[PDB]
Amino acid sequence: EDNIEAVGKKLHEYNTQFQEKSREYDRLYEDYTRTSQEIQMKRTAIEAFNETIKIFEEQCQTQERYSKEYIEKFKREGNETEIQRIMHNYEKLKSRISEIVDSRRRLEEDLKKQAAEYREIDKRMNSIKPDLIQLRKTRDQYLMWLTQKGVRQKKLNEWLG
Amino acid sequence: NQSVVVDFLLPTGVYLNFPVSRNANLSTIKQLLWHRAQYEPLFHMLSGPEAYVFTCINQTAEQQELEDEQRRLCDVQPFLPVLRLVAREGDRVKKLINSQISLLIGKGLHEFDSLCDPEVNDFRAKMCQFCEEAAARRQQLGWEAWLQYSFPLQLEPSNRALLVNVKFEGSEESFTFQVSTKDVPLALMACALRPEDYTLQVNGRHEYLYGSYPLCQFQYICSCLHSGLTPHLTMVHSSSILAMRDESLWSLEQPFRIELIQGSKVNADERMKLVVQAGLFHGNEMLCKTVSSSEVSVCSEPVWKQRLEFDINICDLPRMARLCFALYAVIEKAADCPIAWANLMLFDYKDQLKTGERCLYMWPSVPDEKGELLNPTGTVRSNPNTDSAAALLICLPEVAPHPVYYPALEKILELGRHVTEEEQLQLREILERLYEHEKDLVWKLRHEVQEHFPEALARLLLVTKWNKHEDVAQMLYLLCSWPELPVLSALELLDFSFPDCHVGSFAIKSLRKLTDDELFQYLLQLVQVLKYESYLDCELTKFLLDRALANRKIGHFLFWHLRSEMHVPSVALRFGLILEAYCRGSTHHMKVLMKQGEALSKLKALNDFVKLSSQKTPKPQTKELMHLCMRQEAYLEALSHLQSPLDPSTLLAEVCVEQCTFMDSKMKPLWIMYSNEEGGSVGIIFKNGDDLRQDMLTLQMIQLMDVLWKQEGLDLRMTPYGCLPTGDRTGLIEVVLRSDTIANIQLDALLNWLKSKNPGEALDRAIEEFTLSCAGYCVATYVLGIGDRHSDNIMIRESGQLFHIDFGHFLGNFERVPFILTYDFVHVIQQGKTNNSEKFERFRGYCERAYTILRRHGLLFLHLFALMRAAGLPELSCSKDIQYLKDSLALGKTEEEALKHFRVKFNEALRESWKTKV
Numbered sequence A: 001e002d003n004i005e006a007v008g009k010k011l012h013e014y015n016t017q018f019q020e021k022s023r024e025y026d027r028l029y030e031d032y033t034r035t036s037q038e039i040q041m042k043r044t045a046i047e048a049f050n051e052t053i054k055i056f057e058e059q060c061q062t063q064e065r066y067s068k069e070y071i072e073k074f075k076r077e078g079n080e081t082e083i084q085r086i087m088h089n090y091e092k093l094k095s096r097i098s099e100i101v102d103s104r105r106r107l108e109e110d111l112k113k114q115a116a117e118y119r120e121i122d123k124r125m126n127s128i129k130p131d132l133i134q135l136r137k138t139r140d141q142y143l144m145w146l147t148q149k150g151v152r153q154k155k156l157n158e159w160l161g
Numbered sequence B: 001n002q003s004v005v006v007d008f009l010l011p012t013g014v015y016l017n018f019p020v021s022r023n024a025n026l027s028t029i030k031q032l033l034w035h036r037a038q039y040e041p042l043f044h045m046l047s048g049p050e051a052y053v054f055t056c057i058n059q060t061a062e063q064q065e066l067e068d069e070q071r072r073l074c075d076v077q078p079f080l081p082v083l084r085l086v087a088r089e090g091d092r093v094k095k096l097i098n099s100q101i102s103l104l105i106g107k108g109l110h111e112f113d114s115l116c117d118p119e120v121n122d123f124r125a126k127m128c129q130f131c132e133e134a135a136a137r138r139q140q141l142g143w144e145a146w147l148q149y150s151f152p153l154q155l156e157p158s159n160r161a162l163l164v165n166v167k168f169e170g171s172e173e174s175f176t177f178q179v180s181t182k183d184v185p186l187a188l189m190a191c192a193l194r195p196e197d198y199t200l201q202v203n204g205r206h207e208y209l210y211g212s213y214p215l216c217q218f219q220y221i222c223s224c225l226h227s228g229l230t231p232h233l234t235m236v237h238s239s240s241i242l243a244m245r246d247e248s249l250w251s252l253e254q255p256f257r258i259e260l261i262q263g264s265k266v267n268a269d270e271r272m273k274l275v276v277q278a279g280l281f282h283g284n285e286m287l288c289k290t291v292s293s294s295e296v297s298v299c300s301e302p303v304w305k306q307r308l309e310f311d312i313n314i315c316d317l318p319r320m321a322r323l324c325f326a327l328y329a330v331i332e333k334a335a336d337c338p339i340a341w342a343n344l345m346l347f348d349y350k351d352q353l354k355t356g357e358r359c360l361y362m363w364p365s366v367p368d369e370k371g372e373l374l375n376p377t378g379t380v381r382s383n384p385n386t387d388s389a390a391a392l393l394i395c396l397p398e399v400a401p402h403p404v405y406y407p408a409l410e411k412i413l414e415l416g417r418h419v420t421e422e423e424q425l426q427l428r429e430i431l432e433r434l435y436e437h438e439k440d441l442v443w444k445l446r447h448e449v450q451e452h453f454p455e456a457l458a459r460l461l462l463v464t465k466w467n468k469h470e471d472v473a474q475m476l477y478l479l480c481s482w483p484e485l486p487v488l489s490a491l492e493l494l495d496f497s498f499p500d501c502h503v504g505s506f507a508i509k510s511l512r513k514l515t516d517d518e519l520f521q522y523l524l525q526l527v528q529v530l531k532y533e534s535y536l537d538c539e540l541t542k543f544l545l546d547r548a549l550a551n552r553k554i555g556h557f558l559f560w561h562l563r564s565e566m567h568v569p570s571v572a573l574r575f576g577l578i579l580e581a582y583c584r585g586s587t588h589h590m591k592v593l594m595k596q597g598e599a600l601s602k603l604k605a606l607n608d609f610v611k612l613s614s615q616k617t618p619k620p621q622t623k624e625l626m627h628l629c630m631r632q633e634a635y636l637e638a639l640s641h642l643q644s645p646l647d648p649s650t651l652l653a654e655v656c657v658e659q660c661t662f663m664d665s666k667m668k669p670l671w672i673m674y675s676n677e678e679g680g681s682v683g684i685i686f687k688n689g690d691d692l693r694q695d696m697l698t699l700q701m702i703q704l705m706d707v708l709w710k711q712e713g714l715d716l717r718m719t720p721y722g723c724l725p726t727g728d729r730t731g732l733i734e735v736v737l738r739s740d741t742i743a744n745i746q747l748d749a750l751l752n753w754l755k756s757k758n759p760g761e762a763l764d765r766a767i768e769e770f771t772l773s774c775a776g777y778c779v780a781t782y783v784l785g786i787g788d789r790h791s792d793n794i795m796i797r798e799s800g801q802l803f804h805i806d807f808g809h810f811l812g813n814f815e816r817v818p819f820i821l822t823y824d825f826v827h828v829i830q831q832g833k834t835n836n837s838e839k840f841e842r843f844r845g846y847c848e849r850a851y852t853i854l855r856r857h858g859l860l861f862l863h864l865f866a867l868m869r870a871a872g873l874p875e876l877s878c879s880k881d882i883q884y885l886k887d888s889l890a891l892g893k894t895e896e897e898a899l900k901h902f903r904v905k906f907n908e909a910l911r912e913s914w915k916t917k918v
């Protein structure tokens, strides 16, 4: 189908293209691995927000049960002062929950943008694989054709990169 | 800055918020809390501070009660700075252990509950209870036992006079006297009194000398004799050791079928079309032909809803049958893209044939050299990124109105049970040393194989037709009366080609004869083989946990091999459950591991700073900045007074900060020097971003070579230093001291360095040390296919021992690697002479005997490497990799032929040596 030096040169070209797409694949697979590790970290962080918030809500439940007695025990004894203190303290607990919640939401928004990044990477990995696979094979067929033609290993070594 | 604003939630419902020092311990913070809470409502209802414990949410998202109030807030590392006061009560011991496990293994226990998986819940209940029971048994056995569990003997693979310095615990004065180089330790003790309630400790180490062996069989002693140094020991009373302890299926001829419903979250080229390929396997063999879907257009959420019917009946499917899918994109029939893949066991962990819908979260396919349709070798665990991974939705149909189970052993042997000389010579031929024709013969003469060739069990297992319940029943019948095989053969049977649980179990039964010394040589491979298991409760797990529980040094290295992969999704669950259980059986060691994890966690941050700084500004300054960072109260404490992870009997005591520095390569590895109250000085390299697994394996093989060598009286003075992966591209390397690189020493220069380190009549020792070690490393590197060997990665000890470092690359990879002799080493071997053939001949001898010893244990290396393929090292992927070693060791050749070819390559390497130098 061709002559040897022309086949050997094209082997060098196809090999060079193979090494380059192979490196590019490796770049993506690395982003894949990292991004996967990060997403999982964010997911567990979202769980920690949730457990934290849960804790604040038990504190609220505790405040409503426990306080009751002490608001009615202070009303009779004229301590609308002590009652005020408990309720403003309580009001301070509540505003803090809203902050924690606001942070939880920032995270979920970040996890959202990153889940999508993960899918674009996997999509780009998937659009490359065909060429990668095709290049490996074409390269291997040129090596074969040259081996059968009796080309020595030294020549095949120069051409491979 | 220092402080951080912390939310406090009091049990009255009251909430306070104020700054505390990041450095303050919880005990201090509790005082500050009380002091501020007296001015807030409802103070008078609180009990005292000691009646309550702080709770936080930790980094692993679990609630933790902070029982140890000497801990600093910055070490506690709460998710948000929120501390809650709760009552003490309700089994504080379980609570504490549970919380520590999560932090230690890097994975919250709650993530196992979250799965709502009975297989997982069953594993933890059985194994944790087993591990706890062993632990409780161990406490009730006396002090000897505790000593053996905790500090097993360090013995050489195996009469001049010997003087030794002995002392007693808590006393300056010491007793130097000559003693029996071959008298059992007791007699040293009995003597020093001028008995049976003592052991001897090696000063400044947790190495102990006891048992019925003689003194020069101990590493410490043996190293002392060779060095010339006087042993230094401490007698320790029993009590002071207690004070450490104390403080139906076969009637279903309907064919196997599945319903392919839908995929989800597929990310493929919208021009192309999508196909699922499905096949059935037992291990790596196909049970029947493959069957494929129709093309459907690419979309995110493609829909097939087709029956796929296989060419095998439900009655024929073996226990370990495995359904394997691959999602592929094809350029619409008018390079197929392999998208992703997933495997599924057809019987569950309790033996029941599965029914119903399954959602398989798939793994992405990697374009590799084999390019097989499907990936039957891959894990049967689903991808745990369930939120974003692609998935397949399939439906196993019903088969009978009751559940069906793979039949019980009894019924397998029910079915399983029930001479030519020409045939008895063809078989012998085949096994003295498969293809279609020979498989039929071996199957026919399987009874003969058992009687006469028990060692060929592996071959017979592969000939057997795992798509035929009759055959399978017959094979298992023999398997159950098969006589016990040697360790070597058992190691073959733990490979992926032998997925049947009867096989695994027969293998482990043969591994139980392993000594702790020998098992330790193989520990790493045995770990990797866990990746080939289908179920969580398996015999190999149980065997590894058994031996971890009986020997603390084994449990130490098992923990680090398992912990170092907790970031890998396909094993995080399995390794995590093993680690949990291991921990519950080793609460003492847990305290050592906890200390090591915080040292390491500090080295990570200390290392990330040094990479980041090094970009900004030059080394001398970054060095001083590294030092300031280190002396911070909390860095310093966490980095000081731990047991080394490389060797838990070594104490890393005081960090010598002004000697701490780092290497100049891209990830800036840290060189950390220590000094303990014993040698006297120890070093470690902390790496973060380099992969160490290639270095570990190579160093483990060099070590195994040293043992096998030493076990035949050949001591080649090797330096197989520690390498321990501990995390995601993180781990430690033992510094070899009083050593330097060839490149440094060169810029008769090697020979002069040696002269200066060994003046006068110790030069002959140095040279002989160099000769022995030069042979060992020459043979090692040749056998393993290690090129890229230069003066930067070859070092020399002041004793004269030469050794290689920082391995990189093996089995030919970036091309057989010739045996290699360096003229500059030949020179030293020859004592500075042009021709010293007496010497040079000895060296060739050493080389030849070493190679000869390794050939005799060649199948051992091959099996060990075969199991390491599970690790996914780029350099040890395939069968040709194993082929490199068969050829390097000339195992296809008689020994005589092997030595003759070695000799030839040896001489060519001698010729070559002069030509490179010119």
Ligand SMILES: C[C@@H](c1cnn(Cc2ccccc2)c(=O)c1C1CCCC1)n1nc(-c2cncc(O)c2)c2c(N)ncnc21
Pocket: B661, B662, B663, B664, B671, B685, B695, B721, B723, B733, B734, B735, B736, B737, B739, B740, B741, B744, B792, B805, B806, B807
């Ligand atoms: C190369 C030499 C070395 C490295 N770094 N510094 C610090 C330095 C680096 C740069 C500037 C200043 C200090 C070293 O001073 C050394 C040696 C040079 C002479 C004294 C010690 N080395 N490399 C390993 C090793 C590394 N990576 C993987 C392995 O498997 C083994 C090693 C070792 N285990 N023991 C001793 N020296 C070892």
